[PDB]
């Protein structure tokens, strides 16, 4: 697994530890989407919400997916593409999330949804570029999407972040296939 895939896992872990030690609210205060006008110039916050997980299922599921899909993208398409997929989804999912619901949310799953939509749609519309979501895994992705939508998980779900994330990934596979 490439460096981008790896450092993102590291960072999510460091952040998760920090959340267990200092508490969730303490870490949110530093990392959440700006929740006050004074924080508007704190540029990291438009991204760092992606780094926070609020339970062991949260971090574990998001990182397993990240590891696989993220790692696919990085090896077949390169580190640069994964960085750009990540920044775009993170920023866009974050924006839609806070519009609907407020600045209080976190998780790498806006981004994981981007990677699902991206890998699949690009494997459908662009097979030779080496990227596909195997039939079988598409089903488990599809169920993942569904669980989110219908609030199965037992978690409170960042609704905006999840769709925005998926759209972004589809939009990007679209744009990328047509070449």
């Amino acid at each position: 697994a490439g460096p981008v895939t790896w450092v993102m896992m590291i960072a999510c872990v460091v952040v998760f530890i920090a959340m267990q030690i200092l508490g969730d609210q303490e870490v949110m205060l530093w990392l959440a989407w700006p929740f006050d006008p004074t924080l508007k110039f704190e540029f990291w916050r438009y991204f760092t919400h992606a780094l926070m997980h609020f339970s062991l299922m949260h971090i574990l599921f998001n990182l397993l997916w990240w590891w696989y899909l993220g790692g696919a993208v990085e090896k077949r398409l390169g580190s640069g593409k994964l960085i750009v997929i990540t920044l775009i989804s993170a920023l866009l999912s974050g924006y839609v999330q806070q519009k609907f619901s407020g600045p209080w949310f976190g998780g790498l799953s806006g981004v994981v949804y981007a990677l699902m939509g991206y890998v699949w749609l690009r494997g459908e519309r662009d097979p030779q570029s080496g990227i596909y979501l195997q039939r079988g895994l598409i089903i488990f992705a599809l169920i993942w999407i569904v669980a989110g939508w219908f609030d199965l998980f037992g978690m409170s779900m960042a609704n905006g972040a999840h769709i925005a994330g998926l759209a972004v990934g589809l939009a990007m596979a679209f744009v990328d296939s047509l070449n």
Binding site: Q97, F105, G106, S109, F153, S156, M157, A158, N159
Partner: peptide, 4 residues
């Protein structure tokens, strides 16, 4: 908090 909303998860994601």
């Amino acid at each position: 908090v909303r998860m994601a």
